[PDB]
Enzyme design. Structure first.
Site, PDB file in Angstrom:
ATOM      1  N   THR D  17     -95.611 -21.117  57.204  1.00 32.00           N
ATOM      2  CA  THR D  17     -94.390 -20.536  57.743  1.00 32.00           C
ATOM      3  C   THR D  17     -93.816 -19.432  56.864  1.00 32.00           C
ATOM      4  OG1 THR D  17     -93.171 -22.382  56.746  1.00 32.00           O
ATOM      5  CG2 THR D  17     -93.741 -22.561  59.084  1.00 32.00           C
ATOM      6  N   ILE D  20     -97.944 -16.396  51.555  1.00 33.80           N
ATOM      7  CA  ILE D  20     -99.402 -16.334  51.592  1.00 33.80           C
ATOM      8  C   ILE D  20     -99.945 -17.128  52.771  1.00 33.80           C
ATOM      9  CG2 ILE D  20    -101.441 -16.394  50.109  1.00 33.80           C
ATOM     10  CD1 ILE D  20     -98.157 -17.370  48.547  1.00 33.80           C
ATOM     11  N   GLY D  21     -99.337 -18.280  53.062  1.00 32.47           N
ATOM     12  CA  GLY D  21     -99.779 -19.066  54.202  1.00 32.47           C
ATOM     13  C   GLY D  21     -99.579 -18.341  55.519  1.00 32.47           C
ATOM     14  N   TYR D 155     -97.661 -28.000  37.225  1.00 34.85           N
ATOM     15  CA  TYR D 155     -98.190 -27.191  38.317  1.00 34.85           C
ATOM     16  C   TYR D 155     -99.628 -26.759  38.052  1.00 34.85           C
ATOM     17  CZ  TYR D 155     -99.012 -23.058  41.167  1.00 34.85           C
ATOM     18  OH  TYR D 155     -99.562 -22.130  42.020  1.00 34.85           O
TER      19      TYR D 155
END
Lengths: 215, 215, 215, 215
Positions: D17, D20-21, D155
């Site tokens: 949404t 990058i996606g 991360y």
């Protein structure tokens, strides 16, 4: 004219009651350190201490019977041994369950047992190392961590996670006297020799590395 | 209770008249080996031997004045020192000529000086090591070898070529008592400590590796 | 709704008269580029062009009969084809001579044939690419370059040298429209597909990488 | 004469949404696939679908409003979209909490959100891919995964864990028509181009790789 691996330092080694951990403990003891053997069962701790004494006679050895995979065991260890100059993260489990059969709970449990235990021990012992200006933190991870096998995906994921942990904490502790390194085995004393050199004051310019001791 | 880096062995070190090579020579001498200091000018060889003696008093030291980049100098070294238990390849040149300005002759000369010299020394000294069942061959290559800079393309190419040489000859000499490893520097004695451990009989389960000694 | 690999560009491919090079040439031709097939013998060049035409009917194809391992052949190619938008370095020899039997001349010859030929072609074709603001330079290197086998030490050294060349020239040409990448094979058209994507304007954010196309 | 990136296939993309996606979703849609946009809030899903339609007019697009970090959201997605030919794991969180301040719960939560979500989606969608003899599974992981920063240790650990997941599942699914690969970004459409090529039938000889799309 020779050069020495010598300690007046305290070195705690997780899962040091058998195998590679016991060899690392014996090598650090022969190098003159005060080695803390930690296992879930006090019987195994005592038998490991006895095995070490068999080879190194005047060994400096203590023991803690705790389950470092849990927070309770880590707190017990921190109560019995509040300070460490050398930390060796070696506790870890392993199976070969097929990727499509292993559920979420097993992934999380492998992460908590294999990765978060070492993170806990490092988080507790690193600050005093940074304060005294000298320290060694060493992760023992198998070569499955760099090339994930495919039939042991969970275990390889945890091993590469440990490699990441050691690299990142090395960068985080850079500038201090604490080095963080990983050691990769595939003759147990031959493996232990590298851990001893890394724990020694001579490995002082090696941080954030992965050192192989396979055949 | 301590652990030792000790030698009754012969160790030849190329480009050992200055800098990292001189530090490696001094460390191997302090570890009790017979170190051969090799440089193009005998004056530099003598001054390096004197510097080493300054720090290690009862040092076991010989010298060979030769240019190992050429076959003549390599043959001279092999005539003066036919046998080596430990070989340390450190001779190498370096510039920052732009990629589009450096001609073919310069590429070939950098390959012959930086790569083929070590190949010559290894090709000569490895068989006797394999015969006696024990040996150490160590390549000193900068971190520019893993990540080629871009303004020093020739030099980085030669450094990664040396890394390849050490990896391949390690695999080729596997099963014998000879280990081949590379050491990556970026405190000179701190670098030398790793080379000493690798040259020591304790690094016996480490072959075909690249060991970092950057900050 | 689809996405395209399309060219109005000129692509020269060394050693494109057989095998992986011929497959790369055929794929680039099917993608609509003007492909230059280069081999030492004009007969092989003609037969390769015919093979390509068999599969891609309206292929845009030229040929140059030259020996790119030498400066004379490179100069001949530069005379017949002064400009290239896409350069594919694939010419290379290979044997399995034992490390202790291969002499200095053979090491230097392998370096000159496998590494310096691609360096020559890149040094000539890169400036015009940088001027027009767009270019692709692609090195075809086998997986032996990352893990040197041990029975093929010379060849693996040259392959990792090529990897270093592509990495360094990528960093050197960064900021321009020219990308430099390496492609690693171990179905020939499957290999060629990756080279085609890299040569295409879509791979524009990939420079200094090593892309695998093994099984 | 050209070459195509074309689909009659279904492609689900987590966290598609925004960023990058969303770019990956738009590129796969422009390549002619049926793209499933998945986000926690249906409003964001609708706005992402609208953005995609802005650029690709005849786009084939569905949406699922679910929280894939939890098992409930994954089950909802599997109920609305039982089959996928292409899976793109992109959902992930990120902070910069200091290593000594982040507690156990946060380590476990980052592992469950960033790693186990993709593991869930892959575990569900991979079997049908293996049955039909063709499939693509693509992990989007930042370059922080190969070199753990030190101020973002959690991360980076999760990112390298994802790299391990993709490598291992690639080896596990080898021999089938399913490839598993990781894509490393640091121009969003430039990143999406690589994901599109990998999802395309042309990337069929690339499995277990890590492909960079940094500048």
């Amino acid at each position: 004219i020779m050069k020495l691996d010598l300690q007046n330092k305290i070195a705690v080694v997780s899962g040091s009651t058998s195998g590679i951990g016991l060899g690392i403990a014996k090598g650090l003891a022969s190098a003159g350190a005060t080695v803390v053997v930690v296992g879930r069962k006090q019987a195994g701790v005592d038998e490991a201490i006895a095995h070490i004494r068999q080879s190194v006679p005047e060994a400096s050895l203590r023991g803690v019977d705790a389950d470092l995979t849990t927070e309770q065991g880590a707190a017990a260890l921190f109560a019995a041994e509040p300070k460490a100059d050398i930390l060796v993260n070696n506790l870890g489990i392993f199976n070969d369950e097929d990727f499509f059969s292993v559920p979420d709970e097993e992934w999380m449990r492998f992460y908590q047992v294999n990765v978060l235990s070492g993170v806990r021990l490092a988080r507790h012992y690193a600050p005093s190392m940074v304060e005294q200006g000298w320290g060694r933190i060493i992760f023992i991870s198998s070569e499955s961590g760099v090339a994930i096998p495919g039939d042991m995906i969970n275990y390889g994921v945890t091993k590469s996670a440990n490699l990441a942990v050691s690299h990142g904490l090395a960068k985080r502790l850079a500038g201090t006297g604490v080095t963080v390194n990983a050691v990769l085995p595939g003759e147990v004393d031959e493996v232990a020799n590298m851990v001893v050199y890394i724990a020694s004051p001579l490995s002082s310019a090696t941080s954030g590395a992965a050192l192989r001791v396979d055949g």
